[PDB]
């Protein structure tokens, strides 16, 4: 099953990412945490506290009722319904004094692209991330690669109204063709909508492009310096050497091609390894808002 291979691969990527930046005793803030898909991964890292926030009350309840159903829970868990992009994060976390801010890690797995709906939303999300971190703390995540998206968008003539591409397990469909009509450049960093379909996961839901240059430039304004940016395919090849020993025999088989080498082939190759990038930033400065220091 191709979609299974993709799920396996994307979980391997998340392990590689989490265990690279997260250290024993860390406090972790997972924005857009969904249904607690990444709890086991933070366990291996040896964290102290996990703080999950998601806008969907349904998802948080499935997260609560599921943490109980696992062994080796050596860490405190706080799960919160809240909007991490549209609203200040202090709104969401004030009712939860247990939370130990500032924290060591902020993670956004497959969600930061919902924040690029508007400039206002993108700036709050990043200010939320920056406000939350110790200096020396890391913000890491996974988003669609704007460079892969540009590569594909560049291949369409101006005639095509709603540019679309995909394969058997995924499809992207752009709202308009303003990119092509604007000499193969976005009119704006924000609000660049496309509909994403992934087999048995996302059902034609609107997302936004994240021009990596804009993410990097906003992060800098708020005191985050980029320390790594790699597409999944390149990230995996770099990290896989130190993971083969740690994979269980069944985990090994789910990450192997039919020839026995490690990786993805076929439709998964594009849908998983080319379409997504990881990133990691380090907080280097404490942000102070312009014109905010008064007598
Ligand atoms: N573009 C995009 N992809 C997403 C988003 N959310 C999830 N995905 C992708 O959906 C894939 C599969 O999601 P699910 O099938 O729900 O994965 P899961 O709950 O971890 O399931 P198992 O891996 O089987 O335990 C992930 O590996 C991501 O690549 C999103 O908001 N945007
Ligand atoms: N403004 C928002 N604030 C918080 N969560 C949001 C917001 N917008 C979307 N989300 C959530 O982001 C999640 C996106 C999921 N694709 C990711 C879940 C999980 N992190 C994973 O690795 O799959 C969903 O659970 C959404 O409800």
Author numbering: 141 to 435
Give sentences from the paper.
To elucidate the role of Tyr416 substitutions in ScAbd1 in conferring SFG resistance, ScAbd1Δ140-K163R-K311R-F387Y-Y416F was purified and co-crystallized in the presence of 1 mM SFG and 3 mM GTP. The structure was refined at a resolution of 2.8 Å with Rwork/Rfree of 18.2/21.7. The crystals contained three ScAbd1 complexes in the asymmetric unit and the tertiary structures of the protomers are very similar to each other (r.m.s.d. between 0.21 and 0.25 Å over 256 Cα positions). SFG engages with the same ensemble of enzymic residues observed in the wild-type ScAbd1•SFG•GTP structure and the C-NH2 amine of SFG makes hydrogen bonds with the O6 (2.9 Å) and N7 (2.5 Å) atoms of GTP, à la the wild-type structure. Whereas the GTP contacts in the SFG-resistant ScAbd1 recapitulate many of those seen in the wild-type ternary complex, there are some noteworthy differences. First, only one of the Glu347 carboxylate oxygens is coordinating the guanine-N1 (2.8 Å) and -N2 (3.2 Å) atoms. Second, there is no contact between His253 and guanine-O6 in the variant complex. Third, and most relevant, the Tyr416 phenolic hydroxyl-mediated polar contacts with the guanine-N3 and ribose-O2′ atoms of GTP observed in the wild-type active site are missing in the SFG-resistant variant in which Tyr416 is changed to Phe. Absence of the two hydrogen bonds between GTP and Tyr416 is likely to reduce the cap binding affinity of the SFG-resistant variants. In addition, whereas the electron densities for Phe416 and SFG in the resistant variant are well defined, the density for GTP is relatively weak, specifically around the guanosine and ribose moieties, when compared to the GTP density in the wild-type ternary complex.
The essential enzyme messenger RNA (mRNA) (guanine-N7) methyltransferase catalyzes S-adenosylmethionine (SAM)-dependent conversion of GpppRNA ends to the m7GpppRNA cap structure characteristic of eukaryal mRNAs. The antibiotic sinefungin (SFG) is a SAM analog in which the S-CH3 sulfonium moiety of SAM is replaced by a C-NH2 amine. Available evidence indicates that the antifungal activity of SFG is exerted via inhibition of fungal cap methyltransferase Abd1. Crystal structures of K. lactis and S. cerevisiae Abd1 as binary complexes with SAH or SFG and ternary complexes with GTP•SFG highlight how SFG makes two hydrogen bonds from its C-NH2 amine to the guanine-O6 and -N7 atoms of GTP that account for its higher affinity vis-à-vis SAH and SAM.
